[PDB]
Structure formats: structure tokens, C-alpha cells
Amino acid sequence: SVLQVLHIPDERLRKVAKPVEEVNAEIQRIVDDMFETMYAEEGIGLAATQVDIHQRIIVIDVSENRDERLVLINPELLEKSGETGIEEGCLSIPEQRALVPRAEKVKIRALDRDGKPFELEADGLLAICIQHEMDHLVGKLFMDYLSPLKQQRIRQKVEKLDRLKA
């Protein structure tokens, strides 16, 4: 199933996700629906918080062919280094992109779709995506790193877009 993605300025996007208690069939259905939603909306990442599911679940696919599914359940940041920044987008902030500070490399541990623990060292786009998605789980958005003026402009553009959509 495809889920609706919350758009700013929805306060539900500020909710802090709780850890997944057990990776079972219910959680796996959520993961699959999140991937379907992410692909349908042409994104490279999606956090459960964005679909009003407040649990630490993240789906990602940074591959060129869009056929490399990465699942991060209960992700934990183990180490990070350097700094970088690219113009990030977000399905909750439709059609708007802005550069924000991020660590260049990160090492995390999490559970996969089967509930199996794994460690992952990432850099480049994947590292940035992981940080972006983990921010969602603690109620943070990329626009939060921008100036009040930049934020206001983004806010108005998204509201205008949804206005037209409706």
C-alpha cells in the first residue's frame, strides 16, 4: 500500500519515534509500504515519522537503478567524522532543496528487515541520507538548519503547492 506523506507545517513531524520492540510481520508490512511509498514519490529515503508511524524505522535506496533496498530499524550512530553538504530534498518539504551541514562519514548499527543486527560504514550520499533520515526520527527537518527567512520562504512554497494540489 502507498501511504500519505506528511508535509510541513504538520506538528506530527516533530514527534520523537520510539524504538521498534520486535521486527515481526506487522513491522515488515510497514517497511514494505514505506518502500512502495518512497518509490512512488521518487525519493531515496523515508522515515516512519513521515507517514505518521512513530517508530524507529527507515527505508533507503540510493542506487541508480532503484533496486537496492536498505532497511534501518532502531539505527544507532556509533561513529562519525568530517563534514559535508549537498542540496537535500525531502518528501515532507515537497520540491524544495537546500544544503545543510552533515558529517561526511558515519558508522551505524541497526536491525534489517528480518530483525538481524548489522553494522554499516557509509560515506558520500548514503551517509548524508542516513543522517537526514535519522533526524526525522527525532523530529528534525533539514529546513531547521536554515535561517528564519529561508525557512519562511520554504514554508510558503510548500503551502502554495499543497494549495494547488487541493
Ligand X SMILES: OCN(O)CCCc1ccccc1
* Binding residue ranges for Fe cation: 90, 132, 136
Near ligand X by CB under 6 A: residue from 7, 43, 70, 74:
43
Q: What is the largest CA-CA distance in the chain?
A: 44
> Quick check: is 119 catalytic?
no
- Complete edge-to-edge strand list for the sheet that includes strand 45-47: 45-47, 57-60, 70-81, 105-111, 117-122
Q: Which is nearer to Ni ion, 72 or 90 (CB)?
A: 90
Near ligand X by CB under 6 A: residue from 27, 46, 110, 158:
46
DSSP string covering 9-44: T-GGGGPPPBPPS---HHHHHHHHHHHHHHHHTT-S
Under rule CB under 6 A, residue 127 binds ligand X: no
At closest approach, how far in Å is the CB of 56 from ligand X? Answer: 14
Under rule CB under 6 A, residue 45 binds ligand X: yes
> Which uninterrupted H or E stretch holds 137?
helix 124-137
Q: Which is nearer to Ni ion, 73 or 90 (CB)?
A: 90
Under rule CB under 6 A, residue 134 binds ligand X: no
Query: What phi, psi does 125 have (nearest 5°)?
Result: -60, -40
Question: Within 73-102, which residues bind Ni ion (CB under 5 A)?
Answer: 90
17 binds, among Ni ion, ligand X, none (CB under 5 to 8 A by kind): none
- Name the active-site residue from 41, 79, 83, 133: 133
Output the CA–CA distances (angstroms, integers) from residue 156 to 50, 60, 152, in the order listed. 19, 28, 6
Binding site for Ni ion (CB under 5 A): 90
